[PDB]
Structure formats: C-alpha cells, structure tokens
Design a protein around this motif. Sequence first.
Motif, PDB file in Angstrom:
ATOM      1  N   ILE A 124       2.855  64.501  72.140  1.00  0.00           N
ATOM      2  CA  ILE A 124       2.219  64.848  73.414  1.00  0.00           C
ATOM      3  C   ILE A 124       1.762  63.598  74.166  1.00  0.00           C
ATOM      4  N   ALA A 132       0.784  67.305  60.407  1.00  0.00           N
ATOM      5  CA  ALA A 132       1.595  67.912  61.479  1.00  0.00           C
ATOM      6  C   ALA A 132       0.898  67.834  62.842  1.00  0.00           C
ATOM      7  N   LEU A 133      -0.419  68.018  62.837  1.00  0.00           N
ATOM      8  CA  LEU A 133      -1.236  67.870  64.039  1.00  0.00           C
ATOM      9  C   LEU A 133      -1.145  66.452  64.611  1.00  0.00           C
ATOM     10  N   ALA A 165       2.852  75.326  71.806  1.00  0.00           N
ATOM     11  CA  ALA A 165       2.493  74.545  72.995  1.00  0.00           C
ATOM     12  C   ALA A 165       3.334  74.885  74.232  1.00  0.00           C
ATOM     13  N   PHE A 167       5.150  71.202  62.430  1.00  0.00           N
ATOM     14  CA  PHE A 167       5.347  70.416  63.650  1.00  0.00           C
ATOM     15  C   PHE A 167       6.169  71.145  64.713  1.00  0.00           C
ATOM     16  N   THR A 190       4.147  74.085  66.314  1.00  0.00           N
ATOM     17  CA  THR A 190       3.143  73.633  67.291  1.00  0.00           C
ATOM     18  C   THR A 190       3.793  73.277  68.635  1.00  0.00           C
ATOM     19  N   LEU A 191       4.997  72.709  68.587  1.00  0.00           N
ATOM     20  CA  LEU A 191       5.810  72.487  69.793  1.00  0.00           C
ATOM     21  C   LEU A 191       6.159  73.803  70.492  1.00  0.00           C
ATOM     22  N   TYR A 203       2.081  66.110  66.312  1.00  0.00           N
ATOM     23  CA  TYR A 203       1.982  66.811  67.598  1.00  0.00           C
ATOM     24  C   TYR A 203       1.296  65.964  68.676  1.00  0.00           C
ATOM     25  N   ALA A 242      -2.731  73.664  69.331  1.00  0.00           N
ATOM     26  CA  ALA A 242      -1.420  73.489  69.982  1.00  0.00           C
ATOM     27  C   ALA A 242      -1.256  74.371  71.224  1.00  0.00           C
ATOM     28  N   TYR A 279      -2.610  75.486  65.065  1.00  0.00           N
ATOM     29  CA  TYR A 279      -1.843  76.394  65.931  1.00  0.00           C
ATOM     30  C   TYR A 279      -2.614  76.801  67.183  1.00  0.00           C
TER      31      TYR A 279
END
Length: 204
Positions: free
Chosen positions: A188, A180-181, A18, A11, A14-15, A184, A65, A62
């Motif tokens: 978002i 985790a996606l 992003a 998580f 990916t932040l 995310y 993201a 990934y």
Amino acid sequence: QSIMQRILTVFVFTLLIATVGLFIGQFVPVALMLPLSILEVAMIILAFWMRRRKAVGYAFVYTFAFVSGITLFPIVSHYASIAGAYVVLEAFGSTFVIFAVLGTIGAKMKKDLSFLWSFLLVAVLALAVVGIFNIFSPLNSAAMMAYSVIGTIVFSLYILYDLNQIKHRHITEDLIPVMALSLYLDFINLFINLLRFFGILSSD
Ligand SMILES: [Gd]
C-alpha cells in the motif's frame, strides 16, 4: 502447506478485502473526507507501528485491510483527477512487478539481510517526519516528487527485506497475521508513492 505460503495466502486476501473497501470508498462524501496530507502520512505511521506490534489476530488484519481500502480512494481519486486515470494503472502495474520481482528474489536468495533493520527503520521515521511537516507546510511539486522516489525505494527495500526474513528466520504460526499485515502495508505504501510520483510527473 508451509509458513511462507500461508503468509502469502493471507496477503492476497487482504488485497482482495482492500479492493472491496476501495470500491465502497467512492461513496464517501467530501464532508466526511479527511485531508490528503493526513491520509498519506498515516499509512507510513501505521507501517512503522504495526511492525512493532505484539499478538495481532486474523480479525485485526482483515478488518484493517477493509477499512484502509476505504481510506485509499480519496488518494486514488485525487491523483487520477490531476493527471488522468492512466497513472493509477501505471502505479498499480509498477507496484505489482516490483513486488513480484523483489519478493521472489528476497524469498529465495542465500544472503541474509537482517542487518538492514536499523537502516530501514530510520528511513521510515524520516518519511514520517517530512510527511507530518507536509500537513502544516505543504511541500512544492519537486520536493514531493523527491519525497516520492525516496519512499518508493524504502518501501521497495522493505518487500525484499520482509520476504528475506520470512525465509531466513524461524517464524512461528502465531506470527502469520502480523507478517502478512506488514506485506500489505509495504504494498500500500509503495503504491501511494508511485501514484503520487507519476501523478505529479504527468500533472505538468
Ligand atoms: Gd483531492
């Protein structure tokens, strides 16, 4: 070590991925930029879709993201221009404390919130429909503000739900990417709604 920590480890990456996408996203010209309506509702549609997807890998999350980060700058720049840059910090700050507070409560509460799945599923579909309606016939400020507060509540409840199901369900190692996606997309989508809300609220 544990499965919850491995999901939250993914998580955070990916932040980070992003955030690099968001930085790169500033160099996209207006010619190649999609409409604001389409960009906003596509994230709601992907949040619904990616939830029911089977067998998602680390390469998908990934890369997703990164790309989503790029397609977030047009929205960020829009609401910063109409109401000052301070709304982006307000929106991010409010997202961060909501995620920290609700994420922590969900992950350690004794009550199991599995029954909410249907309630939250129909709410995302409603937002998806009203968002798609907004493309063709654009909603006024007050309807968009009403839409934003409702989206904020739905995607706040999804964070509570998601961390709650990670604790309460037997999550195998093969579902670490997809879980985790979803975190995310919850983040978002919560950010977009607070940003639009505070954006319009300061707009007049
Ligand atoms: Gd714009």
